[PDB]
Design a protein around this ligand. Structure first.
Ligand SMILES: [Ca+2]
Ligand SMILES: [Ca+2]
Length: 170
């Protein structure tokens, strides 16, 4: 593993995130004040069968040198999911979905999730999933902030970054 970190989005540069929804649910995103400088506000309304999410599709899918994914989050409290999708076995589209549930609170908090802590999604898997039961870090398609339930809410994210190994002195 590599040491240190690699920033994916501090929201001070170009706009990278797209929105998607279906089956009654709705989502919208905008640039607002973040932890430092800019951040992205995600506003969602859920339905029983509805899905929503915001997605950054990655140009380079090889994350095999990294160990964790980190982000700052704050509510504007409803549970949501951070999701990592592998690349499809058919070449185009999303593959195996891997999830971690998080609940944004009133104050800014840093959430660091090791890749080994992600769980294989069971409510949905896309047709291009590899069914391997292992999160293949060398084959990453995209990252998502997405629905976990049928409820509504608003949150802000900032400082999305990869974390490698720490330099332990003892
Ligand atoms: Ca920022
Ligand atoms: Ca897999």
């Amino acid at each position: 593993s590599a040491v240190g970190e690699k920033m994916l989005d501090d929201f001070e540069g170009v706009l990278n995130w797209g929105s998607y929804s279906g089956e009654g649910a709705k989502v919208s995103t905008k640039i607002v004040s973040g932890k430092t400088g800019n951040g992205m506000e995600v506003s969602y309304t859920g339905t029983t069968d509805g899905y929503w999410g915001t997605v950054y599709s990655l140009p380079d899918g090889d994350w095999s040198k990294w160990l964790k994914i980190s982000f700052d989050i704050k509510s504007v409290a409803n549970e949501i999911r951070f999701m990592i999708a592998e690349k499809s076995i058919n070449g185009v589209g999303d593959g195996e979905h891997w999830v971690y549930s998080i609940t944004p609170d009133s104050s800014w908090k840093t959430i660091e999730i090791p890749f080994s802590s992600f769980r294989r999604r069971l409510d949905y898997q896309p047709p291009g999933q590899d069914m391997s039961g292992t999160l293949d870090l060398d084959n990453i398609d995209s990252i998502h902030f997405m629905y976990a339930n049928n409820k509504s809410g608003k949150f802000v994210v900032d400082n999305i970054k990869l974390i490698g190994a720490l330099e332990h002195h003892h």
